[PDB]
Ligand binder design. Structure first.
Ligand SMILES: C[C@]12CCc3c(ccc4cc(O)ccc34)[C@@H]1CCC2=O
Ligand SMILES: C[C@]12CCc3c(ccc4cc(O)ccc34)[C@@H]1CCC2=O
Lengths: 127, 128
């Protein structure tokens, strides 16, 4: 595909959440451009390229324990970009916890994620 | 106020929405920095300066019964930035409509909005 339309951005970013929820690291790495830049959380030093991205996601999702689901519709632009609200559920201190996040993504002319910024901090972590 | 903390970004960005909701263009322009940049919707040319920002909110808020409310918590960083999901309700040539939007904001070391990006398009519009 080329630069995703607004409707295609909605589908791609929803698909990314489904892949995070099932914990398929390889499928996520494939969604990213080979030289993608990721800032998670935004304000922290970026990581770059599929090698660093694969390591980051496997550290986060390798155990398959995390769950993720959209908490609102994906907002999409006409220049291949979008932003989405979601909630992440995992284990912290034994008790279950929930983290509210917004990801901003820009896609390239091949339909792959070129950049991603994940906005969240401890003020978004419940229980 | 200095560079807003994460908790302070949450309050500031929530404060912006309720200002949009009540339609106080004066109060909203004051929240913006003198040389702020606004991309609304994201993908179009950015606008600069408070006069140009003033006129933008005039066009959008100064007429139709525009209301706005958060549809989720404000996500805040530790570098003075945040993102929030909200819904704009409008009446568009008779048709009651709603628009789902996510705003990304960067605040200055004075607690003013330095940059704003509003993500939405027609796919996010619905008839009520
Ligand atoms: C890593 C993590 C699980 C997944 C996750 C987190 C934060 C932001 C994310 C953003 C994403 O786009 C996808 C997944 C996460 C959590 C923070 C702590 C934790 O357990
Ligand atoms: C301008 C507008 C009303 C307000 C509004 C829109 C879009 C994005 C916004 C982002 C904001 O942070 C505040 C207000 C709006 C609408 C698009 C169509 C319309 O009438």
């Amino acid at each position: 595909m080329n630069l995703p339309t607004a409707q295609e951005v909605q589908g791609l970013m929803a698909r990314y959440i489904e892949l995070v929820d099932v914990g398929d690291i390889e499928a996520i790495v494939q969604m990213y451009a080979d030289d993608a830049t990721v800032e998670n959380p935004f304000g922290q030093p970026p990581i770059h390229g599929r090698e660093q991205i694969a390591a980051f996601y496997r550290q986060g999702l390798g155990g398959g324990k995390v769950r993720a689901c959209l908490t609102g519709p994906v907002r999409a632009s006409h220049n291949g970009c979008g932003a989405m609200p979601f909630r992440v559920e995992m284990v912290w201190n034994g008790q279950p916890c929930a983290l509210d996040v917004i990801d901003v993504m820009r896609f390239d002319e091949h339909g792959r994620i070129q950049t991603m910024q994940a906005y969240w901090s401890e003020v978004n972590l419940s229980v």
